[PDB]
């Protein structure tokens, strides 16, 4: 199946309190494997996954140099943005960046990304063809014109289409154990009465990986599109994820509703009903 | 493998 690598960076200015803070994180799919913190003691790139340990000191040197440089370059940028927008230096501002690539079952290149965001909104972005940019405002328009002159795009297509994918295939093979792990979700339901004539049906999915998943409430075959409560998919804290969906059911008609679960770990979508043999039948025992 | 981010706005 498809896979992807991503590096996320965050730079925040601290008026009257020193240098801005730079936090860089790297993921392969939903698994974090590295990080960098400018205020950190070591002041060097660090491993956040077991399979990235098996790396020579040359890796940690190169990586530290590249990311430690990205700190400098983004610190410089905040300054520039201040001038462009005529903003006061006594105020805090954020600079977010995100770059990376995608692959298919093949291990072939699919899509690339190089993007920036200032104060929570898009600033400039590399288009899908990896040959032209998308400038949000007139400030970015300048940048876009400069970057075109400096050929920043081709330097970046070189990384994305080339290096980027190589390092991803290396991590997917050198990290088979975890990275190609497909954990099915451990479902079940909970019944919660709301009033004297209505009740709530919770549908749960736990310990699943990857994080992509789909819970669907259905009544007699039709989807409870806009009558269904749903939460964000949250990390369990150990690499797996959790999620739940709910509906108010006119008490008495619980069996009419069904919960459907789709996930990469299941050889087939599930169907759960509020009864024994579907997510709640361990109460006929001791 | 991290990239080479060295462009100014």
């Amino acid at each position: 199946g498809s896979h992807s690598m991503r590096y996320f960076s965050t730079s925040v200015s601290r008026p009257g309190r020193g240098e801005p803070r730079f936090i860089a994180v790297g993921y392969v799919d939903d698994t974090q494997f590295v990080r960098f913190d400018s205020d950190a003691a070591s002041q060097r790139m660090e491993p956040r996954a077991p399979w990235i340990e098996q790396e020579g000191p040359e890796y940690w040197d190169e990586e530290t140099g590249k990311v430690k440089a990205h700190s400098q370059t983004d610190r410089e940028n905040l300054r520039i943005a201040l001038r462009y927008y005529n903003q006061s230096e006594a105020g805090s501002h954020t600079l977010q960046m995100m770059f990376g690539c995608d692959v298919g079952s093949d291990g072939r290149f699919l899509r690339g990304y190089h993007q920036y965001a200032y104060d929570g909104k898009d600033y400039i972005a590399l288009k899908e063809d990896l040959r032209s940019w998308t400038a949000a405002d007139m400030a970015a328009q300048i940048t876009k014109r400069k970057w075109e002159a400096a050929h920043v795009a081709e330097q970046q297509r070189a990384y994305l289409e080339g290096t980027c994918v190589d390092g991803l295939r290396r991590y997917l093979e050198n990290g088979k154990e975890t990275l190609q792990r497909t954990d099915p979700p451990k479902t079940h339901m909970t019944h919660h009465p709301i009033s004297d004539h209505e009740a709530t049906l919770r549908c749960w999915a736990l310990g699943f990986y990857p994080a992509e998943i789909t819970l669907t409430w259905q009544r007699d075959g039709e989807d409870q599109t806009q009558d269904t409560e749903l939460v964000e998919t949250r990390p369990a804290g150990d690499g797996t994820f959790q999620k739940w969906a709910a509906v108010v059911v006119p008490s008495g008609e619980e069996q009419r509703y069904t919960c459907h679960v789709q996930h990469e770990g299941l050889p087939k979508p599930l169907t759960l009903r509020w009864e024994p043999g579907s997510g709640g039948g361990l109460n006929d025992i001791f | 493998v991290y990239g080479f981010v060295r462009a100014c706005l």
Binding site: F8, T10, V12, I23, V25, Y27, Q32, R35, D37, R48, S92, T94, Q96, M98, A117, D119, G120, K121, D122, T190, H192, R202, L206, V231, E232, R234, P235, A236, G237, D238, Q242 | -
Partner: protein, 100 residues
Amino acid sequence: MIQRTPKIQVYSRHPAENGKSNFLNCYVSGFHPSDIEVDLLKNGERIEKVEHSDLSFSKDWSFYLLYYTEFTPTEKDEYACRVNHVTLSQPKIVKWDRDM
């Protein structure tokens, strides 16, 4: 300038059961700016040694962050999360409910 208040979910790593070690989580997401105060509370008082994930963000540029600590659920103790951000007037407190 754009600002988004956090979304909070306070839950246990594994299905809680009294007298067993487990993990208390508090997940904040969809917020901007990034600085945010988060404290886990045991019976109202702040739980000391706690750990959080490395700052990251979603496709829509908003930040997310997981705060956790090990603990032992008991039939009596009540655990909660306390979050503060600039978009709030008062620090927000979300109780831990092992059911919903």
